[PDB]
């Protein structure tokens, strides 16, 4: 409705070949799934991930508090309210909210994503070590302090983990020199 018939704004998914389903990833309760909708609000089909394929018709009125869905021929009239992030629906004797959620990353993290490395921001010398080598620390913990140009660069552990310290007080250090590694 908001597209106002402007072809580039209408969510038709038009293609020269097979049209692309309008795709929503939705979270409600303990269920997160895609809904794929093809067609137009007057006559559409919707398929749900881990679910079935249903006929859909959707009767949206701008600024209305009510919205109607005919699902496999069963018309239900919902009270609807929407925030930046949640859709609240009530109808058919039940009430719920649904969140639109981001896609999962196609590549999951390696456990290295829990690890971090501290590097000297400046050339200078290590003036204090705040943590014993190979010890558990929290992301609030100052691990190594470098002095350069009369500035104390106190470097804070970015993660909770086992901190291993690579330098001793009085060591000269270069830019980007690893001073500690902190591991999950």
């Amino acid at each position: 409705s908001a597209a106002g018939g402007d072809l580039w704004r209408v969510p038709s998914g038009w293609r020269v070949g097979e049209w692309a389903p309008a795709t929503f990833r939705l979270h409600a309760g303990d269920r997160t799934d895609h809904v794929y909708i093809t067609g137009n609000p007057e006559r559409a089909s919707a398929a749900v991930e881990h679910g079935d394929t249903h006929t859909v018709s959707a009767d949206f009125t701008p600024g209305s508090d009510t919205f109607a869905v005919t699902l496999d021929g069963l018309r239900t009239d919902y009270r609807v309210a929407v925030t930046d992030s949640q859709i609240w629906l009530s109808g058919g004797g039940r009430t719920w909210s649904v969140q639109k959620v981001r896609e999962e990353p196609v590549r999951p993290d390696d456990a290295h994503s829990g690890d971090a490395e501290l590097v000297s921001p400046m050339p200078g010398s290590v003036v204090a070590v705040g943590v014993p080598d190979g010890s558990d620390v929290t992301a609030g913990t100052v691990v190594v302090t470098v002095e350069a140009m009369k500035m104390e660069h106190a470097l804070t552990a970015p993660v909770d983990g086992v901190a291993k310290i690579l330098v001793a007080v009085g060591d000269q250090v270069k830019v980007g020199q690893p001073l500690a590694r902190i591991t999950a």
Partner: protein, 510 residues
């Protein structure tokens, strides 16, 4: 005529579905197994939710290279990203590792030509193994070979047409300039690799052994070399970053012309299957096409009673004003004079031109040459070549010889040109060629004449076929006739985004 059109559109849609898959299934499995999005899912994931996507030449290189290179190994087209229409060019890494074949270069250059002419931001999703070395002389060195891609990036960047790259896989040799020449480059960590010379060359030149991650991995370029501007965790994070970049470009220009509210056409567009013969030898009134594609069926014909083998008039399509020029028979001198006058009106009124080609050629004979049909044709060609408004061309039937030139064929730079599945394009029609060559060879028996004509008909049928045309990028796609209104409607919104030049004509041979 409906069943013949249905059979042709079923063949079209089968070919489109086959090309859309990309490479062999084992290549798709190896691509996804490394945690990548498939190239078409990369494109779809870049678009705004439910955006249309006007794919450029999906059947490029079809029937070429033993069909080993579906879509020429590339996905290109226009889609809405962050509220702007952008040209997206994505290397299909599943087709031969994204190797550039000669048609892959041609398709990349055509996508950049569309972006330059319409002022569209360019997004390059880069994942290519380089040039197809057995045909390197067709991939390199000429003016419209691979080196021209970067010439296009630089000069478009000079005009402020944003050039954005995301490096999603390999990027080697001259291809390393696709990221490095872009205004803003994204690279995926532990996937994207950029180098002017890769591990095999480093080994052959220096004896050093390196992996493609040590030589030019994403960490190296994002932290140390500065060749890249954003480090992405994965393909989805790269597409998200590209969307955020495009959100900084600001809006497109408003059209030069006034756009009204779109009015629905008076007919279901599959009625076009009823009115257009597939056999080009069968005449029909092209008004039956026009009144079905235009808004509300409203069509104000100019010079309706004069030069009646050419139909010219004003309509709207999706609220955009359009001047339609459509063939309705053989071109006479009166028809070309009519066309030139109409184009001058459209130029001054700033109205886009739509050419519906179904042209056998000009009228032949001594009284027509004495009447100066050649100079009336030249006046129409001058008007077409010099017209400053956007031109769109749909080839709905024949497109032969000098009639192709008068009707704004590919040489005249229409912003887009598409073929219907029944179209034919050749220096002359196949039956005309067979007839003229038989007349030159002289008297023959009917069986001797048929045996003489069959190879000529076969040549012109094979070369003039619309899949032969589209495989070579002579057009931007074969389209379903019933989609014509939508395709033009999408294009009319694109071509309004460039400002008009002033009106300027060559000397009309008066």
């Amino acid at each position: 005529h409906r069943d013949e059109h249905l059979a042709l559109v079923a063949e079209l849609r089968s070919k489109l579905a086959a090309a859309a898959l990309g490479g062999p299934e084992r290549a798709r499995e190896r691509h996804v197994g490394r945690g990548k999005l498939l190239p078409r899912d990369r494109v779809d994931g870049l678009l705004d939710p439910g955006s249309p996507f006007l794919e450029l030449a999906p059947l490029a290189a079809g029937g070429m290279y033993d069909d080993e290179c579906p879509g020429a190994g590339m996905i290109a087209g226009i889609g809405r990203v962050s509220g702007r229409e952008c040209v997206i060019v994505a290397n299909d890494a599943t087709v031969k590792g994204g190797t550039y074949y000669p048609i892959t270069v041609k398709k990349h250059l055509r996508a950049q030509e569309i972006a330059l002419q319409n002022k569209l931001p360019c997004i390059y999703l880069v994942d290519s193994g380089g040039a197809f070395l057995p045909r390197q002389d067709e991939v390199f060195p000429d003016r419209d070979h691979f080196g021209r891609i970067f010439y296009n990036q630089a000069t478009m960047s000079a005009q402020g047409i944003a050039q954005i790259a995301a490096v999603l896989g390999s990027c080697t040799a001259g291809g390393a300039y696709v990221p490095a020449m872009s205004d803003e480059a994204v690279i995926v960590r532990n996937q994207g690799t950029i180098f002017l010379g890769g591990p095999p060359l480093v080994k052959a030149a220096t004896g050093e052994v390196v992996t493609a991650e040590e030589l030019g991995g994403g960490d190296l370029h994002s932290k140390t070399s500065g060749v890249t501007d954003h480090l992405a965790h994965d393909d989805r994070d790269a597409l998200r970053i590209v969307r955020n970049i495009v959100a900084t470009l600001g809006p497109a220009e408003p059209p030069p012309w006034q756009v009204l509210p779109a009015v629905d056409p008076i007919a279901d567009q599959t009625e076009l299957y009823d009115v257009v013969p597939v056999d080009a030898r069968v005449p029909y009134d092209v008004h039956e096409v026009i009144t079905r594609i235009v808004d509300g069926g409203e069509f104000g014909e100019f010079k309706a009673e004069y030069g009646t083998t050419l139909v010219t008039g004003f309509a709207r399509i999706h609220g955009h004003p359009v001047g339609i020029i459509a063939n309705n028979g053989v071109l006479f001198g009166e028809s070309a004079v009519k066309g030139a006058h109409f184009i001058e009106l459209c130029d001054k009124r700033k109205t886009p031109l739509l050419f519906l080609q179904n042209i056998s050629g000009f009228m032949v004979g001594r009284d027509y040459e004495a009447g100066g049909i050649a100079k009336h044709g030249a006046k129409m060609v001058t008007a077409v070549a010099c017209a400053r408004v956007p031109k769109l061309t749909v080839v709905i039937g024949g497109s032969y010889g000098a009639g192709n030139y008068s009707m704004c064929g590919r040489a005249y730079s229409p912003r887009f040109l598409w073929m219907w599945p029944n179209a034919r394009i050749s220096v002359m029609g196949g039956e005309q060629a067979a007839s003229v060559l038989a007349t030159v060879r002289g008297e023959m028996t009917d069986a001797e004449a048929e045996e003489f004509k069959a190879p000529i008909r076969e040549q012109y049928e094979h070369q003039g076929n619309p899949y032969y045309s589209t495989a070579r990028l002579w057009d931007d796609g074969v389209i379903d006739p019933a989609d014509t209104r939508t395709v033009v409607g999408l294009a009319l919104s694109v071509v309004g985004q460039a400002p008009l030049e002033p009106v300027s004509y060559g000397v009309f041979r008066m």
